[PDB]
Tab-separated table of C-alpha atoms and ligand atoms in Angstrom:
chain	number	residue	atom	x	y	z
A	15	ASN	CA	-24.968	28.599	-18.851
A	16	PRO	CA	-21.916	26.868	-20.801
A	17	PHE	CA	-19.487	26.209	-17.767
A	18	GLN	CA	-21.793	23.838	-15.770
A	19	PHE	CA	-19.253	24.710	-12.934
A	20	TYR	CA	-21.198	24.416	-9.708
A	21	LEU	CA	-21.058	24.561	-5.832
A	22	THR	CA	-22.080	21.679	-3.310
A	23	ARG	CA	-24.982	22.611	-1.351
A	24	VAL	CA	-24.494	24.239	2.229
A	25	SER	CA	-26.926	23.711	5.256
A	26	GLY	CA	-27.431	26.844	6.902
A	27	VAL	CA	-27.081	29.256	4.383
A	28	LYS	CA	-30.361	31.142	2.564
A	29	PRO	CA	-31.983	29.394	-0.165
A	30	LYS	CA	-31.000	32.083	-2.578
A	31	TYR	CA	-27.643	30.774	-2.220
A	32	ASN	CA	-28.178	27.216	-2.940
A	33	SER	CA	-30.541	27.562	-5.860
A	34	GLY	CA	-28.019	26.802	-8.389
A	35	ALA	CA	-25.903	24.476	-6.043
A	36	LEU	CA	-25.873	20.765	-6.365
A	37	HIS	CA	-25.668	18.072	-3.498
A	38	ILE	CA	-24.205	14.663	-4.414
A	39	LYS	CA	-27.850	13.425	-4.411
A	40	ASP	CA	-28.696	15.644	-7.358
A	41	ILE	CA	-25.893	14.637	-9.363
A	42	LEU	CA	-26.751	10.517	-9.074
A	43	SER	CA	-30.517	11.401	-9.426
A	44	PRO	CA	-32.145	9.719	-12.341
A	45	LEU	CA	-33.119	12.839	-13.650
A	46	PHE	CA	-29.066	13.127	-14.356
A	47	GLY	CA	-29.605	9.471	-16.233
A	48	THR	CA	-30.515	5.938	-15.695
A	49	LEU	CA	-27.535	4.472	-14.268
A	50	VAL	CA	-25.862	1.282	-15.781
A	51	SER	CA	-22.485	1.446	-13.454
A	52	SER	CA	-20.412	4.256	-12.182
A	53	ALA	CA	-16.448	4.732	-11.049
A	54	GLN	CA	-15.722	6.903	-7.821
A	55	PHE	CA	-12.186	8.513	-7.831
A	56	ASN	CA	-11.679	9.928	-4.547
A	57	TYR	CA	-9.216	10.253	-1.349
A	58	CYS	CA	-11.343	9.456	1.350
A	59	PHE	CA	-14.609	7.337	1.264
A	60	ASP	CA	-17.375	6.525	4.185
A	61	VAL	CA	-19.112	3.664	1.780
A	62	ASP	CA	-22.285	3.057	4.000
A	63	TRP	CA	-22.631	7.018	3.360
A	64	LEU	CA	-21.991	6.670	-0.155
A	65	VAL	CA	-24.456	4.145	-1.049
A	66	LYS	CA	-27.049	5.782	0.335
A	67	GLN	CA	-26.372	9.053	-1.809
A	68	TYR	CA	-27.520	6.975	-5.003
A	69	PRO	CA	-31.202	6.651	-5.576
A	70	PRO	CA	-33.088	3.443	-4.034
A	71	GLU	CA	-33.288	2.012	-7.221
A	72	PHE	CA	-29.770	2.464	-8.413
A	73	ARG	CA	-27.953	1.198	-5.347
A	74	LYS	CA	-27.284	-2.274	-6.720
A	75	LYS	CA	-25.745	-1.341	-9.858
A	76	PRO	CA	-21.850	-1.597	-10.091
A	77	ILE	CA	-19.345	0.602	-8.140
A	78	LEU	CA	-15.688	0.822	-8.308
A	79	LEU	CA	-13.671	2.781	-5.858
A	80	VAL	CA	-10.258	3.987	-6.978
A	81	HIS	CA	-8.119	4.941	-3.991
A	82	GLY	CA	-4.569	5.104	-3.204
A	83	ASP	CA	-4.921	3.378	0.446
A	84	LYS	CA	-2.466	1.131	1.583
A	85	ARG	CA	-1.713	-1.646	4.451
A	86	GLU	CA	-4.360	-0.938	7.212
A	87	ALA	CA	-5.909	1.952	5.582
A	88	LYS	CA	-6.361	-0.403	2.471
A	89	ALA	CA	-7.670	-3.354	4.643
A	90	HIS	CA	-10.169	-0.576	6.298
A	91	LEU	CA	-11.382	0.450	3.171
A	92	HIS	CA	-12.085	-3.328	1.607
A	93	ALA	CA	-14.086	-3.847	4.967
A	94	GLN	CA	-16.036	-1.058	4.323
A	95	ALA	CA	-17.427	-2.333	1.182
A	96	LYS	CA	-17.609	-5.930	1.936
A	97	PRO	CA	-21.183	-5.670	2.755
A	98	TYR	CA	-21.972	-4.382	-0.479
A	99	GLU	CA	-21.516	-7.296	-3.442
A	100	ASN	CA	-21.643	-4.655	-6.333
A	101	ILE	CA	-18.833	-2.610	-5.151
A	102	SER	CA	-15.325	-3.346	-6.539
A	103	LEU	CA	-12.186	-1.372	-5.541
A	104	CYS	CA	-9.036	-0.349	-7.586
A	105	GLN	CA	-5.884	0.450	-5.653
A	106	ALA	CA	-3.826	3.691	-7.504
A	107	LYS	CA	-0.180	2.891	-7.788
A	108	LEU	CA	1.939	4.887	-5.603
A	109	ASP	CA	5.465	4.046	-6.491
A	110	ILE	CA	7.106	7.393	-5.169
A	111	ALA	CA	7.040	8.081	-1.284
A	112	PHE	CA	4.396	10.831	0.022
A	113	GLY	CA	2.221	10.203	-2.715
A	114	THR	CA	-1.362	10.559	-2.588
A	115	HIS	CA	-4.544	9.596	-4.537
A	116	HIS	CA	-6.522	12.848	-4.476
A	117	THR	CA	-8.193	12.964	-7.520
A	118	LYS	CA	-11.891	13.427	-7.493
A	119	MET	CA	-14.422	12.121	-10.523
A	120	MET	CA	-17.207	10.723	-11.098
A	121	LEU	CA	-17.673	8.321	-14.475
A	122	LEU	CA	-21.639	7.824	-14.771
A	123	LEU	CA	-22.238	5.234	-17.348
A	124	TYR	CA	-25.998	5.438	-18.057
A	125	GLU	CA	-28.309	3.758	-20.984
A	126	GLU	CA	-28.769	7.009	-22.419
A	127	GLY	CA	-25.009	7.888	-22.735
A	128	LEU	CA	-21.827	8.928	-20.541
A	129	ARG	CA	-20.859	11.693	-17.959
A	130	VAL	CA	-17.973	12.975	-16.457
A	131	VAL	CA	-17.657	14.739	-13.045
A	132	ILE	CA	-14.925	16.660	-11.866
A	133	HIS	CA	-15.096	17.722	-8.383
A	134	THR	CA	-13.228	18.742	-5.104
A	135	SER	CA	-15.425	16.832	-2.363
A	136	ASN	CA	-14.252	13.566	-0.357
A	137	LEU	CA	-17.229	10.914	-0.374
A	138	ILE	CA	-17.985	11.567	3.170
A	139	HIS	CA	-20.778	13.493	4.743
A	140	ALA	CA	-18.841	16.542	6.480
A	141	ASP	CA	-17.289	17.387	2.722
A	142	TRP	CA	-21.086	17.809	1.464
A	143	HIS	CA	-22.246	20.188	4.450
A	144	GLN	CA	-20.826	23.111	5.186
A	145	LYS	CA	-18.071	23.296	3.158
A	146	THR	CA	-17.182	25.464	-0.267
A	147	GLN	CA	-16.643	23.107	-2.883
A	148	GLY	CA	-16.568	22.705	-6.693
A	149	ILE	CA	-18.311	20.715	-9.309
A	150	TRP	CA	-17.566	20.587	-13.117
A	151	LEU	CA	-20.243	18.498	-14.876
A	152	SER	CA	-19.707	17.014	-18.306
A	153	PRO	CA	-22.392	17.173	-20.936
A	154	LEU	CA	-24.276	13.750	-21.359
A	155	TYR	CA	-21.755	12.155	-24.044
A	156	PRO	CA	-23.925	10.063	-26.237
A	157	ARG	CA	-22.860	6.514	-27.588
A	158	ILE	CA	-20.970	6.107	-30.815
A	159	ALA	CA	-23.583	3.879	-32.782
A	160	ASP	CA	-21.526	0.167	-33.252
A	161	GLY	CA	-20.380	-0.101	-36.794
A	162	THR	CA	-19.548	3.720	-36.915
A	163	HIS	CA	-15.857	5.111	-37.231
A	164	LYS	CA	-15.389	8.915	-35.446
A	165	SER	CA	-13.280	9.977	-33.093
A	166	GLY	CA	-15.574	11.549	-30.592
A	167	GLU	CA	-12.865	14.251	-29.638
A	168	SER	CA	-13.246	17.812	-28.770
A	169	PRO	CA	-11.357	20.785	-29.457
A	170	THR	CA	-9.978	20.375	-26.085
A	171	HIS	CA	-8.342	16.990	-26.860
A	172	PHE	CA	-10.582	16.146	-23.479
A	173	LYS	CA	-11.087	12.527	-24.635
A	174	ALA	CA	-7.768	11.449	-25.560
A	175	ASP	CA	-6.506	13.151	-22.146
A	176	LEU	CA	-8.858	11.698	-19.874
A	177	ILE	CA	-7.974	8.260	-21.724
A	178	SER	CA	-4.272	9.079	-21.259
A	179	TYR	CA	-5.264	10.019	-17.442
A	180	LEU	CA	-6.412	6.695	-16.466
A	181	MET	CA	-3.887	4.979	-18.867
A	182	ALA	CA	-1.280	5.716	-16.153
A	183	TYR	CA	-3.052	3.918	-13.686
A	184	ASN	CA	-1.963	0.651	-15.305
A	185	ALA	CA	-5.313	-0.970	-13.617
A	186	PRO	CA	-7.402	-3.662	-15.120
A	187	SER	CA	-10.476	-2.167	-13.844
A	188	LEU	CA	-9.730	0.990	-15.211
A	189	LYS	CA	-9.164	-0.691	-18.911
A	190	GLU	CA	-12.979	-1.125	-18.717
A	191	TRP	CA	-13.577	2.272	-18.355
A	192	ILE	CA	-11.301	3.188	-20.783
A	193	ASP	CA	-12.844	1.261	-23.400
A	194	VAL	CA	-16.419	2.476	-22.218
A	195	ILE	CA	-14.961	6.239	-22.918
A	196	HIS	CA	-13.515	5.182	-26.374
A	197	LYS	CA	-17.330	4.274	-27.266
A	198	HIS	CA	-18.778	7.673	-26.420
A	199	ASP	CA	-18.628	11.001	-28.392
A	200	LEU	CA	-17.423	13.670	-25.678
A	201	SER	CA	-16.741	16.111	-28.750
A	202	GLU	CA	-19.265	18.509	-26.864
A	203	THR	CA	-16.509	19.343	-24.096
A	204	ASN	CA	-15.466	22.926	-23.960
A	205	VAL	CA	-13.014	22.443	-20.743
A	206	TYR	CA	-9.311	21.136	-20.787
A	207	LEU	CA	-8.507	18.437	-18.500
A	208	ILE	CA	-5.351	19.011	-16.213
A	209	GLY	CA	-4.247	15.981	-14.326
A	210	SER	CA	-0.968	14.807	-12.395
A	211	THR	CA	-0.009	11.408	-11.812
A	212	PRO	CA	2.884	10.072	-10.013
A	213	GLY	CA	6.185	9.922	-11.720
A	214	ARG	CA	9.518	11.088	-13.349
A	215	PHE	CA	8.546	13.058	-16.796
A	216	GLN	CA	11.200	14.252	-19.332
A	217	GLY	CA	11.118	14.796	-22.754
A	218	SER	CA	7.869	14.347	-24.847
A	219	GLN	CA	6.068	13.247	-21.790
A	220	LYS	CA	7.280	16.766	-19.633
A	221	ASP	CA	4.014	18.580	-20.659
A	222	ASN	CA	1.381	16.122	-19.880
A	223	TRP	CA	1.195	16.532	-16.323
A	224	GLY	CA	1.272	19.140	-13.591
A	225	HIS	CA	2.213	22.745	-13.963
A	226	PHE	CA	3.937	21.929	-17.060
A	227	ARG	CA	0.648	20.797	-18.254
A	228	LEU	CA	-0.862	24.055	-17.353
A	229	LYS	CA	1.905	25.906	-18.974
A	230	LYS	CA	1.555	24.074	-22.014
A	231	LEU	CA	-2.240	24.786	-22.419
A	232	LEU	CA	-1.452	28.495	-21.570
A	233	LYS	CA	1.301	29.087	-24.176
A	234	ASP	CA	-0.890	27.257	-26.631
A	235	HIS	CA	-4.628	28.056	-26.414
A	236	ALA	CA	-4.407	31.580	-24.293
A	237	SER	CA	-2.973	34.814	-25.905
A	238	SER	CA	-0.673	37.536	-24.182
A	239	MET	CA	-2.409	41.148	-23.913
A	240	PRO	CA	-0.710	44.495	-23.417
A	241	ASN	CA	0.134	45.247	-19.669
A	242	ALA	CA	0.089	41.364	-19.229
A	243	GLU	CA	2.318	41.800	-16.053
A	244	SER	CA	-0.117	43.706	-14.362
A	245	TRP	CA	-2.850	40.835	-14.734
A	246	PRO	CA	-2.748	39.218	-11.023
A	247	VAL	CA	-2.173	35.460	-10.235
A	248	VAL	CA	-4.963	33.950	-7.655
A	249	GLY	CA	-4.398	31.011	-5.847
A	250	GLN	CA	-6.913	29.800	-3.779
A	251	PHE	CA	-6.188	26.143	-1.566
A	252	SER	CA	-6.799	24.377	1.329
A	253	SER	CA	-3.549	23.040	2.261
A	254	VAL	CA	0.076	23.871	1.526
A	255	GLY	CA	3.163	21.791	1.087
A	256	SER	CA	6.748	22.668	2.067
A	257	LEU	CA	7.699	24.991	-0.481
A	258	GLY	CA	11.180	26.170	0.585
A	259	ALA	CA	12.953	28.371	2.289
A	260	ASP	CA	12.343	31.328	0.276
A	261	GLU	CA	10.118	32.277	-2.779
A	262	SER	CA	12.853	31.407	-5.428
A	263	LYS	CA	13.140	27.761	-4.477
A	264	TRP	CA	9.669	26.375	-6.261
A	265	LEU	CA	6.975	29.297	-5.628
A	266	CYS	CA	8.032	32.091	-7.458
A	267	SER	CA	10.557	30.548	-9.701
A	268	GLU	CA	9.035	27.452	-11.579
A	269	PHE	CA	5.442	27.733	-10.056
A	270	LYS	CA	4.460	31.415	-10.931
A	271	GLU	CA	6.499	31.107	-14.071
A	272	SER	CA	3.944	28.448	-15.285
A	273	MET	CA	1.093	30.405	-13.812
A	274	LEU	CA	2.167	33.465	-15.769
A	275	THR	CA	2.173	32.097	-19.531
A	276	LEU	CA	-0.051	33.793	-21.995
A	277	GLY	CA	0.519	33.072	-25.694
A	278	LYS	CA	3.497	31.758	-27.610
A	279	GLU	CA	6.300	34.508	-27.378
A	280	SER	CA	8.995	34.774	-24.485
A	287	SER	CA	6.930	41.138	-10.966
A	288	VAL	CA	3.121	39.937	-11.089
A	289	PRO	CA	1.236	40.261	-7.973
A	290	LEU	CA	0.384	37.095	-6.921
A	291	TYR	CA	-2.490	36.676	-4.232
A	292	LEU	CA	-2.818	33.096	-2.241
A	293	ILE	CA	-6.365	32.982	-0.539
A	294	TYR	CA	-5.947	30.449	2.811
A	295	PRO	CA	-8.263	30.641	5.663
A	296	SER	CA	-7.320	32.325	8.477
A	297	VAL	CA	-7.941	31.339	12.214
A	298	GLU	CA	-10.390	33.460	12.627
A	299	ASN	CA	-11.925	32.577	9.389
A	300	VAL	CA	-12.147	28.985	10.959
A	301	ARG	CA	-13.220	29.907	14.205
A	302	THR	CA	-16.199	31.756	13.146
A	303	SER	CA	-17.158	29.467	10.287
A	304	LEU	CA	-20.554	27.224	10.251
A	305	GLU	CA	-18.509	24.254	11.080
A	306	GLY	CA	-16.494	26.067	14.099
A	307	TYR	CA	-12.675	24.807	14.645
A	308	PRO	CA	-13.762	21.160	13.267
A	309	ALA	CA	-13.645	22.617	9.749
A	310	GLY	CA	-9.820	23.206	10.257
A	311	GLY	CA	-9.420	19.145	10.126
A	312	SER	CA	-9.849	19.566	6.445
A	313	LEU	CA	-7.287	22.394	6.174
A	314	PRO	CA	-4.055	20.158	7.180
A	315	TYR	CA	-1.039	23.020	7.216
A	316	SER	CA	1.044	21.433	9.644
A	317	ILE	CA	3.075	23.565	12.286
A	318	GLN	CA	6.371	21.923	11.370
A	319	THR	CA	5.733	22.791	7.499
A	320	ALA	CA	4.984	26.540	8.181
A	321	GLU	CA	7.287	27.442	10.644
A	322	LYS	CA	9.853	26.665	8.327
A	323	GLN	CA	8.440	29.104	5.438
A	324	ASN	CA	6.960	32.031	7.125
A	325	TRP	CA	8.224	34.294	4.218
A	326	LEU	CA	4.542	32.632	2.416
A	327	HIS	CA	2.239	33.983	4.826
A	328	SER	CA	2.601	37.622	3.609
A	329	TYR	CA	0.965	36.549	0.115
A	330	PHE	CA	-2.049	35.082	2.389
A	331	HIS	CA	-5.459	36.717	2.144
A	332	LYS	CA	-8.888	35.929	3.896
A	333	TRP	CA	-11.325	33.280	2.781
A	334	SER	CA	-14.477	35.762	1.884
A	335	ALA	CA	-17.426	34.816	-0.398
A	336	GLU	CA	-20.212	37.154	0.169
A	337	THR	CA	-20.702	36.631	-3.421
A	338	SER	CA	-21.885	33.021	-2.921
A	339	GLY	CA	-23.117	33.588	0.499
A	340	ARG	CA	-20.196	31.376	1.909
A	341	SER	CA	-17.882	33.404	4.102
A	342	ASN	CA	-18.730	31.017	6.758
A	343	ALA	CA	-18.519	27.785	4.782
A	344	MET	CA	-14.448	27.044	4.898
A	345	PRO	CA	-12.808	25.904	1.370
A	346	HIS	CA	-12.129	22.597	-0.037
A	347	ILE	CA	-12.471	23.884	-3.362
A	348	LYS	CA	-9.280	24.562	-5.039
A	349	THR	CA	-9.119	27.257	-7.629
A	350	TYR	CA	-6.314	29.258	-9.546
A	351	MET	CA	-7.180	32.066	-12.144
A	352	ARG	CA	-6.038	34.801	-13.577
A	353	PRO	CA	-7.872	38.338	-13.523
A	354	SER	CA	-7.152	41.721	-14.894
A	355	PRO	CA	-5.779	44.398	-12.826
A	356	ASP	CA	-9.103	45.550	-11.674
A	357	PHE	CA	-10.657	41.976	-11.155
A	358	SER	CA	-13.280	42.601	-13.635
A	359	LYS	CA	-12.557	40.004	-16.046
A	360	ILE	CA	-10.318	36.817	-15.894
A	361	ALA	CA	-8.054	35.149	-18.833
A	362	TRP	CA	-8.556	31.735	-17.475
A	363	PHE	CA	-9.963	29.658	-14.184
A	364	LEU	CA	-8.911	26.278	-13.103
A	365	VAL	CA	-10.544	24.146	-10.218
A	366	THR	CA	-9.002	20.991	-9.288
A	367	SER	CA	-7.878	18.872	-6.513
A	368	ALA	CA	-4.253	20.024	-6.442
A	369	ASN	CA	-3.369	22.127	-3.496
A	370	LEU	CA	-0.312	24.505	-3.268
A	371	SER	CA	2.299	21.509	-3.228
A	372	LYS	CA	4.915	20.256	-5.230
A	373	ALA	CA	3.813	16.707	-4.818
A	374	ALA	CA	0.666	17.871	-6.737
A	375	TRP	CA	1.950	19.975	-9.372
A	376	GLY	CA	5.378	19.127	-9.838
A	377	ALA	CA	8.896	19.827	-8.913
A	378	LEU	CA	11.571	19.906	-11.732
A	379	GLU	CA	14.403	17.920	-11.363
A	380	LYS	CA	17.969	16.408	-12.771
A	381	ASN	CA	19.424	19.787	-13.905
A	382	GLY	CA	15.718	20.816	-14.905
A	383	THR	CA	15.276	18.242	-17.352
A	384	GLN	CA	12.792	16.139	-15.380
A	385	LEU	CA	9.416	16.983	-13.660
A	386	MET	CA	8.567	14.995	-10.494
A	387	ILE	CA	5.131	14.499	-9.398
A	388	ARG	CA	3.905	12.662	-6.298
A	389	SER	CA	0.319	12.571	-6.669
A	390	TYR	CA	-2.760	11.751	-8.519
A	391	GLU	CA	-4.922	15.217	-9.055
A	392	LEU	CA	-7.725	16.349	-11.492
A	393	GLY	CA	-8.925	19.864	-12.392
A	394	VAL	CA	-10.571	21.385	-15.231
A	395	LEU	CA	-9.508	24.379	-17.149
A	396	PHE	CA	-11.857	26.823	-18.885
A	397	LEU	CA	-10.047	29.176	-21.452
A	398	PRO	CA	-11.668	32.001	-23.037
A	399	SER	CA	-10.624	30.592	-26.774
A	400	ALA	CA	-12.786	27.457	-26.149
A	401	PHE	CA	-15.782	29.869	-25.949
A	402	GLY	CA	-15.269	31.984	-28.642
A	403	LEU	CA	-14.114	34.639	-26.406
A	404	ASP	CA	-10.904	36.637	-25.700
A	405	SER	CA	-11.532	36.973	-21.902
A	406	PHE	CA	-14.264	35.825	-19.310
A	407	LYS	CA	-16.417	39.028	-17.523
A	408	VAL	CA	-16.607	38.052	-13.792
A	409	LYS	CA	-20.214	37.293	-12.574
A	410	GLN	CA	-20.773	39.876	-9.872
A	411	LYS	CA	-23.210	37.673	-7.814
A	412	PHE	CA	-22.354	34.046	-7.905
A	413	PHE	CA	-26.150	33.363	-8.079
A	414	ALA	CA	-27.346	36.342	-9.724
A	415	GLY	CA	-27.552	37.003	-13.700
A	420	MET	CA	-24.655	34.447	-19.541
A	421	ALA	CA	-20.974	34.403	-20.841
A	422	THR	CA	-20.101	35.925	-17.812
A	423	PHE	CA	-17.906	33.163	-15.330
A	424	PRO	CA	-19.244	32.445	-12.019
A	425	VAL	CA	-16.345	33.523	-9.513
A	426	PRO	CA	-17.046	31.720	-6.168
A	427	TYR	CA	-15.517	34.007	-3.924
A	428	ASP	CA	-15.103	37.873	-3.310
A	429	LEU	CA	-12.433	39.993	-5.514
A	430	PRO	CA	-10.031	41.783	-4.877
A	431	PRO	CA	-8.849	39.360	-1.992
A	432	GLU	CA	-8.420	40.894	1.633
A	433	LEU	CA	-5.169	40.795	2.805
A	434	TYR	CA	-4.493	39.263	6.120
A	435	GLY	CA	-4.896	41.870	9.163
A	436	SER	CA	-1.817	42.335	11.152
A	437	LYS	CA	-3.649	40.029	14.085
A	438	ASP	CA	-4.439	37.250	11.532
A	439	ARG	CA	-2.474	33.840	11.220
A	440	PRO	CA	-2.866	30.985	8.712
A	441	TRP	CA	-4.837	28.111	10.392
A	442	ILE	CA	-2.546	25.741	11.494
A	443	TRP	CA	-4.009	22.643	12.221
A	444	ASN	CA	-1.964	20.729	15.003
A	445	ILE	CA	-1.845	23.765	17.528
A	446	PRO	CA	-3.964	24.283	20.076
A	447	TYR	CA	-6.903	27.561	19.800
A	448	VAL	CA	-7.609	28.451	23.426
A	449	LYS	CA	-7.942	32.153	23.685
A	450	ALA	CA	-11.778	32.225	21.632
A	451	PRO	CA	-14.383	30.038	21.121
A	452	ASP	CA	-15.992	28.643	17.956
A	453	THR	CA	-19.568	28.952	16.568
A	454	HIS	CA	-20.417	25.645	18.992
A	455	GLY	CA	-18.926	26.865	22.242
A	456	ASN	CA	-15.397	24.940	21.852
A	457	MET	CA	-11.801	25.358	21.852
A	458	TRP	CA	-9.113	23.683	19.262
A	459	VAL	CA	-6.653	21.164	21.577
A	460	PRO	CA	-5.269	18.560	18.840
B	501	GNY	C1	-3.181	15.409	4.656
B	501	GNY	C2	-3.967	14.629	5.082
B	501	GNY	C3	-3.968	13.494	6.041
B	501	GNY	C4	-5.529	15.152	4.914
B	501	GNY	C5	-5.843	15.631	6.137
B	501	GNY	C6	-7.195	16.189	5.982
B	501	GNY	C7	-8.095	16.456	4.917
B	501	GNY	C8	-7.680	16.122	3.818
B	501	GNY	C9	-7.799	16.177	2.457
B	501	GNY	O1	-9.097	16.848	2.520
B	501	GNY	C10	-7.352	15.962	1.343
B	501	GNY	C11	-8.217	15.729	0.031
B	501	GNY	O2	-9.370	15.902	-0.148
B	501	GNY	O3	-7.353	15.776	-1.131
B	501	GNY	C12	-6.294	15.166	1.386
B	501	GNY	N1	-5.694	14.656	2.542
B	501	GNY	C13	-6.160	15.401	3.708
């Protein structure tokens, strides 16, 4: 398959639903390349667990952990890594309040080349155990011979865009990785990079990041079709930010407007997929799955209008209806959900912090967080649209959507999972209630 989009292995589903899945030990195995050095960009780390996922023969190779932690959290991460002399740390600067380093990425330098992995999982055991998570695996990128002068660039500009993303950190440990990427040939890449980085972007930088980056790519590299206003937008996420007092404040004004863009010219249904309380209760993990779905009652009660958009998590297509989602995806299906105009897998949840919010009379895009995803556009594959794969693991130009379509609206008795209130009416799959 040309897409190289995978789900993580889930403990407890039948083998047929893990056949094409990847565990972190598979990604780091010597079958993928002979590791020389790696960088792990992430939010949450269990360093003892993480080192055990590398093959024994590679556990002393240098590892860089790129994180956003401050103060006591930073001390704790440094303490975790001190037993391992080969581990260095890079603290991503977060100069805007309430920002986080959410990007999940592996840079894997081998004897044979370089690989880039952009994914959705934290580096802790529970994120790879019984969750639905997404992985994009780059090709093996060869080294450019010393003395040869070539760009190593792809038609999607992935090499320059990844270097731009790393340059935004202004970090000495990542200048070394930038130099590594410069030395490799990434021309075979068929995905577009969509990143967020903290800052206030105007003028020539406005389209570099966040939902304006998505808008720019859709304007330039997708085409509008007749009846485009009948093609829904689907957003699927594991937490929600404060979006405002009504949909016109951000969700259906600037966010949806970027998501609806197609082509260069100047009432679309919006489906938002987010686990209900029942989804969490009956899940493989039970209520503890809700520890990774951090929607607070304080936020939720200020935006009850939002929940009329919510649809249940359902993933019979991939055997994962009971594996709660930590993947985030956004896509543009046809009115009958048989095709899609594009697909994005990302770390970005449904929040202004991740996607950006316009400021200063619409001239400035303010982003609080680091995020990273990859965009699949039919034009990058020589196609007008992607056919949707009917079963995720069945069966080559059909795109494997990991959850069921069309999405199913919350029932009248359903409620969105809200993590900091108690659920004491019905026990979960392990026999427990939820008392925060
Ligand atoms: C809001 C914070 C405290 C949080 C709680 C639980 C899970 C989180 C998570 O999974 C991520 C992430 O992976 O991006 C980021 N923040 C998470």
